[PDB]
Amino acid sequence: GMNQSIIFTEQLTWDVQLSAIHFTAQQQGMVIDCYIGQKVLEHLAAEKINNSEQALSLFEQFRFDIEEQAEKLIEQEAFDVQGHIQVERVD
């Protein structure tokens, strides 16, 4: 229905602590850290990841599907115990 003004701000990095692509959303000035783990992205792409350049390229290939899912999770209040959004399934 309405415009919740959740913006994906495209700060795309690899997080070695989590083995995940870290991407950013923002709503009314507040940043929401979002993550898609290596294995999730490998399954989605049907490709194993062996270079961070490749990881970022795969995120970009599926950016709008991934961000769609993160947006839904945010709307559904599916935040984790650190206030983050973990994308566990796409498509």
Coordinates of N, CA, C and O in Angstrom, one line a residue:
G1 N 0.8 -1.2 0.0 CA 0.0 0.0 0.0 C 0.9 1.3 0.0 O 1.0 1.9 -1.0
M2 N 1.4 1.6 1.2 CA 2.0 2.9 1.4 C 3.5 2.9 1.2 O 4.2 1.8 1.2
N3 N 4.1 4.1 1.1 CA 5.5 4.3 0.9 C 6.2 4.3 2.3 O 6.1 5.3 3.1
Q4 N 6.8 3.2 2.7 CA 7.5 3.1 4.0 C 8.9 3.8 3.9 O 9.7 3.8 4.9
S5 N 9.3 4.2 2.7 CA 10.6 5.0 2.6 C 11.8 4.2 3.0 O 12.8 4.8 3.5
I6 N 11.8 2.9 2.8 CA 13.0 2.0 3.1 C 13.9 2.1 1.9 O 13.6 1.7 0.8
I7 N 15.1 2.7 2.0 CA 16.0 3.0 0.9 C 17.2 2.1 1.0 O 17.8 1.9 2.1
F8 N 17.6 1.5 -0.1 CA 18.8 0.7 -0.1 C 20.0 1.6 -0.6 O 19.9 2.0 -1.8
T9 N 20.9 1.8 0.3 CA 21.9 2.8 0.0 C 23.2 2.3 -0.6 O 24.2 3.1 -0.9
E10 N 23.3 1.0 -0.9 CA 24.3 0.4 -1.8 C 25.8 0.6 -1.3 O 26.7 0.8 -2.0
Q11 N 25.9 0.5 0.1 CA 27.2 0.4 0.7 C 27.4 -1.2 0.8 O 26.7 -1.8 1.6
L12 N 28.1 -1.7 -0.2 CA 28.2 -3.2 -0.4 C 29.6 -3.5 0.0 O 30.6 -3.0 -0.6
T13 N 29.7 -4.4 1.0 CA 31.1 -4.9 1.5 C 31.0 -6.4 1.8 O 29.9 -7.0 2.0
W14 N 32.2 -7.0 1.9 CA 32.3 -8.4 2.5 C 32.6 -8.3 4.0 O 33.6 -7.5 4.4
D15 N 31.9 -9.0 4.8 CA 32.1 -9.1 6.2 C 32.8 -10.5 6.5 O 32.2 -11.6 6.4
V16 N 34.1 -10.5 6.8 CA 34.8 -11.8 7.0 C 34.4 -12.5 8.3 O 34.5 -13.7 8.4
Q17 N 33.8 -11.7 9.3 CA 33.4 -12.3 10.6 C 32.2 -13.2 10.4 O 32.1 -14.3 10.9
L18 N 31.4 -12.8 9.5 CA 30.1 -13.5 9.2 C 30.2 -14.3 7.9 O 29.3 -15.1 7.6
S19 N 31.2 -14.1 7.0 CA 31.3 -14.7 5.7 C 30.0 -14.3 4.9 O 29.2 -15.2 4.6
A20 N 29.7 -13.0 4.8 CA 28.5 -12.5 4.2 C 28.8 -11.3 3.4 O 29.7 -10.5 3.7
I21 N 27.9 -11.0 2.4 CA 27.8 -9.7 1.9 C 27.0 -8.8 2.8 O 25.9 -9.2 3.3
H22 N 27.6 -7.7 3.2 CA 26.9 -6.7 4.1 C 26.4 -5.6 3.1 O 27.2 -5.0 2.3
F23 N 25.1 -5.3 3.2 CA 24.5 -4.2 2.4 C 23.6 -3.4 3.4 O 23.3 -3.8 4.4
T24 N 23.3 -2.2 2.9 CA 22.7 -1.2 3.8 C 21.3 -0.7 3.4 O 21.1 -0.6 2.2
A25 N 20.4 -0.6 4.3 CA 19.1 0.0 4.1 C 19.1 1.2 5.1 O 19.9 1.3 6.0
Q26 N 18.2 2.1 4.8 CA 18.0 3.2 5.7 C 16.6 3.6 5.7 O 15.9 3.6 4.7
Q27 N 16.1 4.0 6.9 CA 14.7 4.5 6.9 C 14.7 5.8 7.8 O 15.2 5.7 9.0
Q28 N 14.3 6.9 7.3 CA 14.1 8.1 8.0 C 15.4 8.3 8.8 O 15.3 8.6 10.1
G29 N 16.6 8.2 8.2 CA 17.8 8.5 8.8 C 18.5 7.4 9.6 O 19.7 7.6 10.0
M30 N 17.8 6.3 9.8 CA 18.4 5.2 10.6 C 18.8 4.1 9.7 O 18.0 3.6 8.9
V31 N 20.1 3.7 9.8 CA 20.7 2.7 9.0 C 20.3 1.3 9.6 O 20.2 1.1 10.8
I32 N 19.9 0.4 8.7 CA 19.6 -1.0 8.9 C 20.7 -1.8 8.2 O 20.7 -1.8 6.9
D33 N 21.5 -2.5 9.0 CA 22.5 -3.4 8.4 C 21.9 -4.7 7.9 O 21.2 -5.5 8.7
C34 N 22.1 -5.1 6.7 CA 21.5 -6.3 6.1 C 22.7 -7.2 5.6 O 23.7 -6.7 5.2
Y35 N 22.4 -8.5 5.7 CA 23.4 -9.5 5.4 C 22.8 -10.6 4.6 O 21.7 -11.0 4.8
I36 N 23.6 -11.1 3.6 CA 23.3 -12.3 2.9 C 24.6 -13.2 2.9 O 25.6 -12.8 2.5
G37 N 24.4 -14.4 3.6 CA 25.6 -15.2 3.8 C 26.1 -15.9 2.5 O 25.4 -16.0 1.5
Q38 N 27.4 -16.2 2.6 CA 28.0 -16.8 1.4 C 27.2 -18.0 0.8 O 27.0 -18.0 -0.4
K39 N 26.8 -18.9 1.7 CA 26.1 -20.1 1.2 C 24.7 -19.7 0.6 O 24.4 -20.3 -0.5
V40 N 24.0 -18.7 1.1 CA 22.8 -18.3 0.6 C 23.0 -17.8 -0.9 O 22.2 -18.1 -1.8
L41 N 24.0 -17.0 -1.0 CA 24.3 -16.4 -2.3 C 24.8 -17.4 -3.3 O 24.4 -17.4 -4.5
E42 N 25.6 -18.4 -2.9 CA 26.0 -19.5 -3.7 C 24.9 -20.3 -4.2 O 24.8 -20.7 -5.4
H43 N 23.9 -20.7 -3.3 CA 22.7 -21.4 -3.7 C 21.9 -20.6 -4.7 O 21.5 -21.1 -5.7
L44 N 21.7 -19.3 -4.4 CA 20.9 -18.5 -5.3 C 21.5 -18.4 -6.7 O 20.8 -18.5 -7.7
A45 N 22.8 -18.2 -6.8 CA 23.5 -18.0 -8.1 C 23.8 -19.3 -8.7 O 24.2 -19.4 -9.9
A46 N 23.7 -20.5 -8.0 CA 24.2 -21.8 -8.5 C 25.7 -21.7 -8.9 O 26.1 -22.3 -9.9
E47 N 26.4 -21.1 -8.0 CA 27.9 -20.9 -8.2 C 28.6 -20.8 -6.9 O 28.2 -20.0 -6.0
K48 N 29.7 -21.4 -6.8 CA 30.5 -21.3 -5.6 C 31.4 -20.0 -5.7 O 31.9 -19.7 -6.8
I49 N 31.6 -19.4 -4.6 CA 32.3 -18.1 -4.5 C 33.7 -18.3 -4.0 O 33.9 -19.0 -3.0
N50 N 34.7 -17.8 -4.8 CA 36.1 -17.9 -4.4 C 36.9 -16.6 -4.4 O 38.1 -16.7 -4.3
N51 N 36.2 -15.5 -4.7 CA 36.8 -14.2 -4.8 C 35.8 -13.2 -4.4 O 34.6 -13.3 -4.7
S52 N 36.2 -12.2 -3.5 CA 35.3 -11.2 -3.1 C 34.8 -10.3 -4.3 O 33.6 -9.8 -4.2
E53 N 35.5 -10.2 -5.4 CA 35.0 -9.5 -6.6 C 33.8 -10.2 -7.1 O 32.8 -9.6 -7.5
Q54 N 33.9 -11.5 -7.2 CA 32.9 -12.4 -7.7 C 31.7 -12.4 -6.8 O 30.5 -12.3 -7.2
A55 N 31.9 -12.4 -5.4 CA 30.8 -12.2 -4.4 C 30.0 -11.0 -4.7 O 28.8 -11.0 -4.7
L56 N 30.7 -9.8 -4.9 CA 30.0 -8.6 -5.1 C 29.3 -8.6 -6.5 O 28.1 -8.2 -6.6
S57 N 29.9 -9.2 -7.5 CA 29.2 -9.4 -8.8 C 27.9 -10.2 -8.7 O 26.9 -9.9 -9.3
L58 N 28.0 -11.3 -7.9 CA 26.8 -12.1 -7.7 C 25.7 -11.3 -7.0 O 24.5 -11.4 -7.4
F59 N 26.0 -10.6 -5.9 CA 25.1 -9.7 -5.3 C 24.4 -8.7 -6.3 O 23.1 -8.6 -6.4
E60 N 25.3 -8.1 -7.1 CA 24.7 -7.2 -8.2 C 23.8 -7.9 -9.2 O 22.7 -7.3 -9.5
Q61 N 24.2 -9.1 -9.6 CA 23.3 -9.9 -10.5 C 21.9 -10.1 -9.9 O 20.9 -10.1 -10.7
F62 N 21.8 -10.3 -8.6 CA 20.5 -10.6 -8.0 C 20.1 -9.4 -7.0 O 19.3 -9.6 -6.1
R63 N 20.7 -8.2 -7.2 CA 20.5 -7.1 -6.3 C 19.0 -6.9 -6.0 O 18.6 -6.8 -4.8
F64 N 18.2 -6.8 -7.0 CA 16.8 -6.4 -6.8 C 15.9 -7.5 -6.1 O 15.1 -7.3 -5.3
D65 N 16.3 -8.8 -6.4 CA 15.7 -9.9 -5.7 C 16.1 -9.9 -4.2 O 15.3 -10.2 -3.3
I66 N 17.3 -9.7 -4.0 CA 17.9 -9.7 -2.6 C 17.3 -8.6 -1.8 O 16.8 -8.7 -0.7
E67 N 17.4 -7.3 -2.3 CA 16.8 -6.2 -1.6 C 15.3 -6.2 -1.5 O 14.8 -5.8 -0.4
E68 N 14.6 -6.9 -2.4 CA 13.2 -7.1 -2.3 C 12.9 -7.9 -1.0 O 12.0 -7.5 -0.2
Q69 N 13.6 -8.9 -0.9 CA 13.5 -9.8 0.3 C 13.9 -9.1 1.6 O 13.1 -9.2 2.6
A70 N 15.0 -8.3 1.6 CA 15.3 -7.5 2.8 C 14.2 -6.6 3.2 O 13.9 -6.4 4.4
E71 N 13.6 -5.9 2.1 CA 12.6 -5.0 2.4 C 11.4 -5.6 3.1 O 10.8 -5.1 4.0
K72 N 11.0 -6.8 2.6 CA 9.9 -7.6 3.2 C 10.2 -7.9 4.6 O 9.4 -7.8 5.5
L73 N 11.5 -8.4 4.8 CA 11.9 -8.8 6.2 C 11.8 -7.6 7.2 O 11.3 -7.7 8.3
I74 N 12.2 -6.4 6.7 CA 12.1 -5.2 7.5 C 10.7 -4.8 7.8 O 10.3 -4.6 9.0
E75 N 9.8 -4.9 6.8 CA 8.4 -4.6 7.0 C 7.7 -5.6 8.0 O 6.8 -5.2 8.7
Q76 N 8.2 -6.8 8.0 CA 7.7 -7.9 8.9 C 8.4 -7.9 10.2 O 8.1 -8.8 11.1
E77 N 9.3 -6.9 10.5 CA 10.0 -6.9 11.8 C 10.9 -8.1 12.1 O 11.1 -8.5 13.2
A78 N 11.4 -8.7 11.0 CA 12.2 -9.9 11.1 C 13.7 -9.5 11.4 O 14.6 -9.9 10.7
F79 N 13.9 -8.7 12.4 CA 15.2 -8.3 12.9 C 15.8 -9.4 13.8 O 15.0 -10.0 14.6
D80 N 17.1 -9.6 13.7 CA 17.8 -10.5 14.6 C 18.2 -10.0 15.9 O 17.8 -8.9 16.2
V81 N 18.8 -10.8 16.7 CA 19.1 -10.4 18.1 C 20.2 -9.3 18.2 O 20.6 -8.8 19.3
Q82 N 20.8 -8.9 17.0 CA 21.7 -7.7 17.0 C 21.1 -6.5 16.2 O 21.8 -5.5 15.9
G83 N 19.8 -6.5 15.9 CA 19.1 -5.5 15.2 C 19.4 -5.5 13.7 O 19.2 -4.4 13.0
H84 N 19.9 -6.6 13.2 CA 20.2 -6.7 11.8 C 19.2 -7.5 11.0 O 18.3 -8.2 11.6
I85 N 19.3 -7.5 9.7 CA 18.4 -8.2 8.8 C 19.3 -9.3 8.1 O 20.3 -8.9 7.5
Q86 N 18.9 -10.5 8.2 CA 19.6 -11.6 7.6 C 18.7 -12.2 6.5 O 17.6 -12.8 6.8
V87 N 19.1 -12.1 5.3 CA 18.4 -12.7 4.1 C 18.8 -14.2 4.0 O 19.9 -14.5 3.8
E88 N 17.8 -15.0 4.3 CA 18.1 -16.5 4.4 C 17.6 -17.3 3.2 O 18.0 -18.4 2.9
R89 N 16.6 -16.7 2.5 CA 16.0 -17.3 1.3 C 15.6 -16.2 0.3 O 15.0 -15.2 0.7
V90 N 15.9 -16.4 -0.9 CA 15.6 -15.6 -2.0 C 15.1 -16.5 -3.2 O 15.9 -17.4 -3.6
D91 N 14.0 -16.1 -3.7 CA 13.4 -16.8 -4.9 C 13.2 -18.3 -4.6 O 12.7 -18.7 -3.5

